[PDB]
Design a protein around this ligand. Structure first.
Ligand SMILES: CCCCCCCCCCCCCCCCCC(=O)O
Length: 133
């Protein structure tokens, strides 16, 4: 049900990522490098386990999860969170919880592009990824 999300994706547009990072308490120097970084996101499946890799010249991350089953995660900015990823309205919705805080990472396909919407506090960031062959 997730299959159109699978593959290798490259960042091609970013709006309000600094706002999002600052809301999370990321320091200025990290925000500065991150603002010029273009990650590659690789989404693969093996049975109902999904692996999501984010690779860049700055930070790399990898998570594996079953849809609808909570997992522990340590984010790129070193938050230790309780996470769950589900399909909702055809969107891949990743909710992270820690210290009573929450943030959502929502992925939706629009005209073949992967749109990642990141919300924390009032900050709303929209990052667009395009498929690599
Ligand atoms: C792994 C590369 C992530 C993007 C560059 C480094 C950012 C580090 C500080 C902010 C981390 C916030 C949580 C992760 C944001 C992921 C954004 C994305 O996948 O495009």
């Amino acid at each position: 049900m997730v299959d159109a999300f699978l593959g290798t994706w490259k960042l091609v547009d970013s709006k309000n990522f600094d706002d999002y990072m600052k809301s999370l308490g990321v320091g200025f120097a990290t925000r500065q490098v991150a603002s010029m970084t273009k990650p590659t996101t690789i989404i693969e499946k093996n049975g109902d386990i999904l692996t999501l890799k984010t690779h860049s010249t700055f930070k790399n991350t990898e998570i594996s999860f079953k849809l609808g089953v909570e997992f522990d995660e340590t984010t790129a900015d070193d938050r230790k969170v309780k996470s769950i990823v589900t399909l909702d309205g055809g969107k891949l919705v990743h909710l992270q919880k820690w210290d009573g805080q929450e943030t959502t990472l929502v992925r939706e396909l629009i005209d073949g592009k992967l749109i990642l919407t990141l919300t924390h506090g009032t900050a709303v960031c929209t990052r667009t990824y395009e498929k690599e062959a």
